[PDB]
């Protein structure tokens, strides 16, 4: 009712203004909790009416932050849950609602153990005295490496991101586990790529090509790893998989204020200059070797299948 | 005599042969205030090298040659001894001190080679002040012809390359590319320049001012954003610090990165290097010969937390900020020298003879 | 030779050792094989013989006149100095490593480089090394005025009030040339400081630099600072 | 405590004339969005639970504009209180009205209605609450400034301020403007009263985000000649042995903040908004969720709305904004410009650093540089406007008529430099 409305707009203004909550799995949990609160606090007789309700609120929720696609594809998976259960109950008022709620709770209990399942398969991709390269900061790759470091000894070249150096966080989080990590700038990637054995990165959104948007500077990292033919590991969960094609819509990169690149104390050259700060970058699927998700390892020639196993083609435009 | 500068931090296991110093401490803390072993111009130059006040490769070579002029003007001849051996033997510890302050760019090595060859070719029948003036004139001719006149020649050879309406990408700060762009804007070409900069030097801001004060439309961004702008770039100009024997291009660390991303976008690369920066040294990767700057320079203040403030307390943490890297010559299309526009793979053939 | 140290005496060897010996000891510690020392004649014009009784390696002690200033003291030895001048004073015992100030003279190629240790208001740039302004109300009628060009070129200027001059200078050749060509300056602490600070607000210009130490403090001509020299020398002279 | 804010939606300066004689300056659009929406977005993004809008001139229009906005919806987190009176005529009158009405509770935000900002003040508000708990209600006002070089086109010559602050406790000791003064005079009792360090600051751009206290309203009702903010801080800093009440300061170096006062600030702040210096407040984010303002962000900061219909040969190079429903002819050249919604542009026109509001109509062959075209205005063919040319509220210039550099023309005779007609003269 009114509480639900104020919860929806507090979430939508939180995504419009800044990063709330901090990491992406928390936001997926908030989106699933908000959607279960939506389907428990409304009235419907047909499933398509609830479909259009979820579509009408999710359109505003994706219009808040179009770079944050976790809310959008999480809403889209809830829509596919609605469509699957309506199809399995059509071939239906309270049993259908409680089945949707328990399937969403199933989705939460599979979604909560995502990083630990990715960490459990980390040991089959890391051998001892190996040089790993990481861009940015990500909790998935951090759990991956600090799980593989319980039995292996290797090296990690974590590279900072030039707009705001978030990978320094990962360095001080890795050196607490004893990884022998190495911090450098992203101007040295191709300078060091001749000795990096494997590149293990995270991402922000997996697209339907197998392509991915990620923190800026990772398309350069993918090009340098394609030049040196080193494999790429994308430690990504299965809620960063979105059906949005790369060149379809605009607003792909998230541009932020140019303060982080060029400060305001520069002078009157700010009025005659064009400063851009794209915090995201697009990596085509041909520069990617392997995806590591909670269900295992997959090729970039397989993501479309995960799309058809997780989304419906009528909900792509949402 | 002259001690060794102390190694700072935990060195990289791959870079164990290369020295890694710090800008916090100086070598001149334990040296005499009246400069007696090293000439005072040499200790002034080494201090302003170690602190980073002169960072350009041509500015470092110029300050080296000017300090050598101050040494040669303030030189005296010992009894029954020749200039052509003692002056070399006195300038060699000077270059050792300059190496211990900061490793020399290949411009400085070739300048030392030219000065050593010139001071060997001083006649024995010539007097003191006549040979001193001859050496001063030779050093003056060297700087004038090698950099100033080669720069004008490179500017003329690059003006017939820059067209109207195109976009040009530059990286870092180098007086040669900035002079090329300025004299192309003044001579009539109307273009816009993007500028890629990188941490922690952020020296591209310098060339940004140089293009805004010259009236050039400019765009400023960092290295990771280069993949975003190379779709707009039609030409990438680069400033080389050394050209190697195999045709590789030694420059700042983002040079090879930018060349790879530019080739991925089908963007022709153009290096501009003067022929005195030609090295007989040859290398195939960015690992066997490079300079390591301060690892405590990589830290920055993003809010109220500096992640790398106490980075030395973490024993398993290593910090490295390379200054130079090399590009393979199959990434570079032009090499614009004062001898002309040559390809990259033909550079040691024409440079040698 | 890079430097020629000059110690001024314009109107005292009261302590555990000679008061001229501490500046000379500092000089003879780090280089300075030849030292130019000025003897006193304001109190008594017989001090040149008391200056030639020390045990330094080599001193050139000269007599001076009674009615004289620091600018006339440096202008008196102008045809006998050939390189940069490093000026000191008698009541100035400093445990600070001196090579910092010459580094500020060498690294930036300064025109004047000076050292202070905590009346006279000074304004120094946010870097902490290059000074920009200095004045006291002994010669200021109005409260305080700042040129606009130095605020456009230096937007934040940290001011200090309790800082006192340690009288350890590092002058170049052309500054002392201007001092000998301009005999209107009498106190170099108030003439060469303020006139060069005004002339530094000019591109091609001169550089003025300062080092603020925090280990000890200098003395005064009066008996206000005559009590701390022995207290400094009882705990600082064991290493010396 | 809930965070309150007092918004003065009527700048009592005579600056936007005759721009302001039709709509008040708070309804003036930067890029299709009025300034009151920017200010309310800043207040709602900082976390203000209740504001007090104080509108004096053309206040019914502000009431009809602001009631249909996002901040008067019952679903809005930031409740507004539109308070209008035809009696008060200055900012001191607003705050003495605040003290008479007893609106605020604890540490409100005094701000004007035409400030563009994205400053998160909760750290500065934490600092202010710490100082109020330490000094026992001695610190009164916390002025928010932004680090900026004096060469920036944002800070102009009429509003450049120089401050003198004790940098260890971050309190303001002296405050004065630089209007018509090449030299700056600082008193000397500042150094003798506090010998723990002192610093002068010329790098401070005034954001006018002064965090205040109920003691501010007490001081405004206690002294009648305090007309505005600078009068308050100048009377508080010269009087220390009576009414001690020291003023503190906060400086932001990572967030944007500036207010408009004349055309110069308007142009600089609009160029900063178009160049995304005030992210998240960007014209594609649609912080005021109006369906007639949504845009698409292309390369080179080109913002395009829906149903724009660019002509063939029209070149938009950088920092262009087009509202919803504008149409642009062929072989055009538009840069550094803001075009309102529903305009009509002719053929072979050059629009550089211009600001076209809603409903304009540009004929073919026109050259407009650094101008301001207000609502429903139009230019005929063969016209070229010089830089800093303002025409307002359904003006029309004659064809083959070039205006001078200093050119403000409107329908009002005595407030503008000319009068609007079909021809350029009479």
Structural domain spans, chain B? 1-153, 154-353
Rounded Cα–Cα distance for residues D58 and C32 (Å): 80
Nearest Cα to Cα of residue D358 among D346, D345, D342: D342
Rounded Cα–Cα distance for residues D379 and D346 (Å): 10
Q: Give Rg (Cα) of chain C.
A: 18
Rounded Cα–Cα distance for residues D367 and D360 (Å): 15
Count of CB atoms within 10 A of residue B125's CB? 5
Rounded Cα–Cα distance for residues B273 and B270 (Å): 10
Is C225:C218 a contact under the CB 8 Å cutoff? yes
Is B37:B93 a contact under the CB 8 Å cutoff? yes
Number of domains in chain C: 1
Alpha carbon C229 to chain centroid distance?
18
List of residues 6+ apart from D101 with CB closer than 8 A: D83
| Residues paired with A237 in a beta bridge | none
Q: Is the dihedral of CA D218, D219, D222, D227 positive or negative?
A: negative
Count of CB atoms within 10 A of residue C227's CB? 10
Count of CB atoms within 10 A of residue B157's CB? 18
- Between chains, do D150 and C121 touch, taking CB under 8 Å as contact? no
Final resolution, Å: 3.0
**Distances from the Cα of B203 to the Cα of A132, B199, C10, C132, C188, angstroms:** 29, 8, 50, 27, 40
Strands (E), chain A: 131-135, 155-159, 181-184, 198-201, 205-206, 212-215, 232-235, 273-275, 280-283, 290-293, 296-298
- Judge whether A246 is closer than 8 Å to chain B, CB to CB: no
Is A158:A182 a contact under the CB 8 Å cutoff? yes
Cβ–Cβ pairs < 8 A, chains A and D: 74
Sheet of D389-391, strand order: D296-297, D303-304, D321-322, D338-339, D355-356, D371-373, D389-391, D407-410, D418-419
3-state secondary structure of B264: helix
3-state secondary structure of B171: strand
3-state secondary structure of B217: coil
- Between chains, do D297 and A250 touch, taking CB under 8 Å as contact? yes
Tokens of A282: 């697009």
Is B253:B200 a contact under the CB 8 Å cutoff? no
Closest Cα of chain C to B344: distance in Å?
39
Rounded Cα–Cα distance for residues B56 and B52 (Å): 10
- Judge whether A19 is closer than 8 Å to chain B, CB to CB: no
Chains contacting D (3 or more CB pairs within 8 Å)? A, C
Rounded Cα–Cα distance for residues B316 and A245 (Å): 41
Task: Return left, alpha or beta for B340; rule: phi > 0 is left, psi -120 to 50 is alpha, else beta.
Answer: left
Judged on CB neighbours under 10 Å (0-12, 13-18, 19+), D129 is middle
Sheet of D344-345, strand order: D344-345, D361-362, D378-379, D396-397
Q: Is the dihedral of CA D62, D65, D70, D75 positive or negative?
A: positive
- Angle subtended by helix axes A70-90 and A24-40, to nearest 10: 40
Nearest Cα to Cα of residue A135 among A112, A98, A162: A162
Nearest Cα to Cα of residue D407 among D376, D369, D362, D380: D369
Rounded Cα–Cα distance for residues D242 and D376 (Å): 55
Can you tell me which residue has the tokens 């350890």? C168
Is A235:A134 a contact under the CB 8 Å cutoff? no
Q: Which among D149, D253, D280 has CB closest to A267?
A: D149
Is D116:D35 a contact under the CB 8 Å cutoff? yes
Tokens of A304: 């479309």
* Domain range for C55: 1-240
Rounded Cα–Cα distance for residues D75 and D78 (Å): 9
- Between chains, do D187 and C143 touch, taking CB under 8 Å as contact? yes
- Judge whether D253 is closer than 8 Å to chain C, CB to CB: no
Q: Which among C32, C97, C108 has CB closest to B34?
A: C32
The C-alpha angle D154, D157, D163, rounded to 5 degrees, equals: 85
Q: Give Rg (Cα) of chain B.
A: 22
Judged on CB neighbours under 10 Å (0-12, 13-18, 19+), C204 is exposed
Residue-level length of chain B: 353
- If you ran DSSP here, which 8-state letter would residue C127 be given? T
Can you tell me which residue has the tokens 């701390």? C228
Rounded Cα–Cα distance for residues B194 and B203 (Å): 14
- Judge whether A191 is closer than 8 Å to chain B, CB to CB: yes
Pairing of strands D161-166, D171-177: antiparallel
Rounded Cα–Cα distance for residues A100 and A81 (Å): 7
Nearest Cα to Cα of residue D346 among D380, D317, D396: D380
Residue-level length of chain A: 318
CATH superfamily of D4-275: Spore Coat Polysaccharide Biosynthesis Protein SpsA; Chain A (3.90.550.10)
Question: B100 φ, ψ to 5°?
Answer: -70, -25
Nearest Cα to Cα of residue D323 among D295, D344, D362, D289: D295
- Angle subtended by helix axes B106-120 and B128-143, to nearest 10: 150
Rounded Cα–Cα distance for residues A206 and C196 (Å): 65
Contacts 24+ apart (CB under 8 A), D179-183: D182/C148, D183/C145, D183/C146, D183/C147, D183/C148
Rounded Cα–Cα distance for residues D363 and D350 (Å): 11
Question: B173 φ, ψ to 5°?
Answer: -120, 125
Q: Give Rg (Cα) of chain A.
A: 21
Q: Is the peptide bond before D18 cis (omega within 30 degrees of 0)?
A: yes
3-state secondary structure of D393: coil
Is A278:B225 a contact under the CB 8 Å cutoff? yes
Rounded Cα–Cα distance for residues D109 and D248 (Å): 14
Query: Secondary structure of D129-173 in the HEC alphabet?
Result: HHHHHHCCCCCCCEEEEEECCCCCCCCCCCCCEEEEEECCCCEEE
Rounded Cα–Cα distance for residues D8 and D92 (Å): 11
Count of CB atoms within 10 A of residue D122's CB? 11
- Angle subtended by helix axes A24-40 and A47-64, to nearest 10: 140
Rounded Cα–Cα distance for residues B238 and B246 (Å): 18
| Helix residue ranges per DSSP H, chain B | 40-50, 57-73, 83-101, 106-120, 128-143, 150-159, 175-187, 204-213, 226-229, 254-264, 347-352
Closest Cα of chain A to D321: distance in Å?
15
Can you tell me which residue has the tokens 């030299």? D183
Q: Which among B34, B47, B48 has CB closest to C1?
A: B34
Is B240:B327 a contact under the CB 8 Å cutoff? no
Rounded Cα–Cα distance for residues D306 and D293 (Å): 9
Is A49:A88 a contact under the CB 8 Å cutoff? no
From the candidates B18, B196, B222, which should be mutated to test the interface with A, based on the most A CB atoms within 10 A?
Answer: B222
- Angle subtended by helix axes A47-64 and A2-17, to nearest 10: 30
Rounded Cα–Cα distance for residues C117 and C18 (Å): 23
Q: In angstroms, how far is the first alpha carbon of chain B from the final one? A: 41
Is B5:B100 a contact under the CB 8 Å cutoff? yes
- Between chains, do C31 and B29 touch, taking CB under 8 Å as contact? no
Tokens of A8: 């929806």
């Amino acid at each position: 009712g009114s509480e639900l409305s104020e919860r929806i707009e507090s979430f939508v203004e939180t995504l419009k203004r800044g990063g709330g909550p901090r990491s992406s799995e928390e936001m997926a949990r908030e989106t699933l909790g908000l959607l279960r609160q939506i389907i428990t606090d409304h009235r419907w007789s047909n499933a398509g009416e609830l479909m259009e309700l979820i579509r009408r609120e999710g359109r505003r929720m994706t219009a808040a932050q179009p770079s944050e696609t976790t809310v959008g594809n999480m809403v889209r998976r809830v829509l596919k849950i609605i469509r699957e259960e309506y199809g399995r109950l059509h071939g239906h008022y309270a049993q259908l609602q409680s089945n949707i709620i328990e399937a969403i709770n199933e989705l939460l209990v599979e979604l909560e153990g995502t990083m630990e399942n990715i960490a459990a398969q980390a040991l089959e991709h890391i051998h001892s005295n190996e040089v790993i390269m990481t861009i940015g900061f990500s909790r998935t790759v951090e759990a991956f490496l600090k799980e593989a470091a319980r039995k292996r000894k290797f090296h990690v070249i974590v590279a900072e991101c030039a707009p705001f150096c978030q990978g320094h966080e990962m360095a001080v989080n890795l050196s607490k586990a004893g990884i022998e990590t190495t911090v450098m700038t992203d101007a040295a990637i191709f300078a060091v790529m001749s000795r990096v054995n494997k590149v293990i990165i995270g991402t922000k959104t997996i697209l339907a090509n197998g392509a991915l948007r990620a923190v800026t500077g990772t398309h350069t990292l993918a090009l340098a790893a394609k030049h040196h033919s080193t494999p790429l590991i994308v430690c990504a969960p299965m809620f960063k998989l979105s059906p949005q094609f790369p060149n379809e819509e605009d607003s792909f990169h998230k541009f932020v204020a140019p303060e982080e690149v060029l400060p305001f104390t520069e002078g009157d050259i700010l009025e005659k200059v064009s400063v851009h700060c794209p915090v995201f970058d697009y990596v085509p699927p041909e520069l990617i070797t392997l995806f590591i998700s909670n269900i295992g390892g997959n090729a970039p020639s397989y993501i479309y299948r995960l799309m058809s196993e997780l989304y419906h083609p009528d909900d792509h435009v949402l | 005599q002259v001690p060794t500068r102390k190694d700072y931090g935990s060195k990289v296991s791959l870079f164990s042969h290369l020295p890694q110093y710090s800008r916090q401490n100086s070598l001149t803390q334990f040296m005499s205030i009246p400069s007696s072993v090293i000439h005072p111009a040499m200790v002034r130059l080494g201090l302003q090298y170690s602190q980073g006040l002169v960072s350009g490769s041509n500015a470092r070579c110029i300050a080296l040659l000017r300090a050598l002029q101050q040494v040669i003007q303030d030189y005296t001849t010992p009894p029954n001894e020749e200039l052509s051996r003692d002056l070399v033997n006195k300038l060699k510890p000077y270059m050792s001190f300059l190496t211990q302050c900061r490793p020399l760019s290949a411009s400085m090595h070739n300048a030392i080679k030219f000065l050593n060859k010139e001071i060997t070719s001083v006649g024995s029948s010539k007097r003191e002040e006549e040979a001193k003036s001859e050496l001063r004139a030779a050093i003056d001719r060297y700087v004038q012809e090698k950099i100033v006149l080669a720069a004008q020649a490179i500017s003329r050879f690059a003006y017939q390359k820059i067209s109207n309406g195109d976009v040009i990408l530059v990286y870092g700060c180098s007086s040669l590319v900035s002079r090329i762009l300025q004299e192309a804007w003044t001579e009539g070409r109307r273009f816009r320049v993007v500028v890629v900069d990188s941490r922690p030097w952020l020296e591209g801001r310098h060339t940004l001012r140089s293009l805004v004060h010259a009236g050039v439309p400019a765009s400023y961004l960092l290295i990771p954003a280069a993949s975003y702008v190379l779709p707009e770039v039609s030409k990438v100009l680069l400033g080389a610090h050394a050209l190697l024997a195999n045709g590789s291009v030694m420059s700042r660390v983002g040079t090879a990165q930018l060349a790879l991303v530019a080739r991925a976008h089908n963007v022709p690369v153009l290096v501009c290097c003067e022929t005195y920066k030609f090295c007989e040294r040859v290398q195939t990767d960015a690992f066997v010969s490079n300079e390591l700057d301060d690892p405590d320079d990589l830290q920055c203040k993003r809010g109220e937390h500096v992640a790398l403030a106490n980075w030395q307390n973490h024993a398993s943490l290593r910090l490295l900020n390379l200054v130079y890297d090399v590009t393979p010559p199959e990434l570079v299309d032009l090499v614009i020298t004062e001898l002309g526009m040559i390809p990259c793979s033909s550079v040691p053939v024409v440079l040698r003879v | 030779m890079e430097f020629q140290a000059v110690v001024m005496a314009v109107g005292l060897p009261v302590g555990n050792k000679p008061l001229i010996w501490y500046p000379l000891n500092l000089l003879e510690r780090v280089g300075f094989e030849e030292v130019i020392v000025v003897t006193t004649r304001d109190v008594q014009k017989a001090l040149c013989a008391e200056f030639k009784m020390k045990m330094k390696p080599d001193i050139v002690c000269i007599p001076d006149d009674a009615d004289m200033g620091t600018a006339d003291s440096l202008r008196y030895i102008y045809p006998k100095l050939k390189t940069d001048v490093l000026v000191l004073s008698c009541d100035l015992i400093t445990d600070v490593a001196l090579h910092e100030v010459v580094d500020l003279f060498r690294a930036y190629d300064a025109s004047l480089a000076m050292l202070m240790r905590k009346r006279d208001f000074i304004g120094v740039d946010s870097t902490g090394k290059r000074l920009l302004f200095m004045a006291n109300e002994a010669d200021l009628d109005e409260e305080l005025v700042i040129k606009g060009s130095i605020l456009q070129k230096h937007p934040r200027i940290r001011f200090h009030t309790g800082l006192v001059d340690a009288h350890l200078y590092c002058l170049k050749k052309y500054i002392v040339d201007f001092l000998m060509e301009n005999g209107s300056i009498t106190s170099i602490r108030s003439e060469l400081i303020p006139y060069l600070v005004r002339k530094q607000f000019s591109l091609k210009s001169l550089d003025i630099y300062s080092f603020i130490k925090e280990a000890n403090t200098l003395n005064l001509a009066p008996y206000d600072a005559c009590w701390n020299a022995c207290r400094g020398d009882r705990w600082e002279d064991l290493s010396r | 405590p809930p965070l309150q804010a007092v918004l003065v939606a009527d700048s009592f300066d005579r600056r936007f004339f005759p721009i302001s004689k039709d709509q008040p300056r708070v309804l003036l659009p930067l890029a299709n969005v009025a300034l009151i929406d920017y200010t309310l977005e800043f207040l709602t993004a900082t976390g203000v639970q209740e504001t007090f809008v104080f509108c004096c001139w053309k206040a019914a229009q502000i009431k009809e504009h602001l009631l249909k906005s996002k901040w008067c919806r019952p679903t809005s987190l930031n409740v507004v209180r539109i308070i209008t009176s035809e009696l008060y005529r200055s900012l001191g009158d607003v705050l003495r009205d605040v003290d008479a009405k007893a609106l605020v509770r604890s540490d409100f935000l005094l701000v004007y209605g035409d400030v563009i900002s994205n400053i998160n003040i909760t750290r500065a508000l934490e600092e202010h609450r710490l100082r109020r708990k330490l000094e026992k209600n001695v610190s009164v006002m916390t002025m928010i400034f932004k680090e900026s070089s004096p060469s920036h086109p944002t800070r102009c010559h009429e509003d450049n301020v120089v401050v003198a602050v004790d940098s260890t406790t971050n309190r303001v000791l002296h405050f004065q403007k630089t209007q018509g003064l090449r030299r700056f005079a600082f008193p000397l009792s500042l150094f003798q009263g506090s010998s723990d360090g002192v610093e002068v600051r010329y790098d401070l751009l005034d954001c006018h985000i002064s965090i205040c206290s109920p003691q501010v309203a007490q001081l405004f009702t206690d002294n009648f000649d305090y007309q505005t903010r600078d009068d308050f801080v100048r009377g508080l800093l010269v009087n220390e042995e009576i009414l001690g009440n020291q003023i503190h300061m906060h400086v932001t170096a990572k967030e944007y903040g500036a207010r408009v006062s004349n055309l110069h600030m308007y142009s600089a702040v609009c160029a900063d908004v178009i160049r995304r210096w005030v992210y998240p407040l960007t014209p594609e984010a649609n912080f005021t969720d109006s369906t007639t303002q949504s845009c698409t962000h292309s390369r080179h900061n080109i913002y395009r709305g829906p149903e724009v219909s660019l002509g063939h040969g029209s070149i938009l190079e950088e920092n262009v904004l087009l509202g919803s429903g504008t149409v642009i002819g062929s072989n055009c050249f538009i840069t550094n410009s803001v075009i309102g919604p529903g305009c009509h542009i002719g053929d072979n026109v050059v629009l550089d650093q211009t600001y076209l509001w809603q409903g304009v109509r540009v004929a073919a062959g026109a050259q407009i540089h650094q101008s301001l075209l207000c609502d429903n205005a139009e230019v005929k063919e063969r016209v070229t406007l010089k830089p800093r040319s303002v025409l307002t509220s359904q003006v029309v210039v004659g064809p083959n008529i070039t205006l001078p550099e200093g050119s403000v023309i409107s329908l009002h005779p005595p407030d503008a430099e000319e009068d609007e007609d079909d021809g350029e003269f009479s």
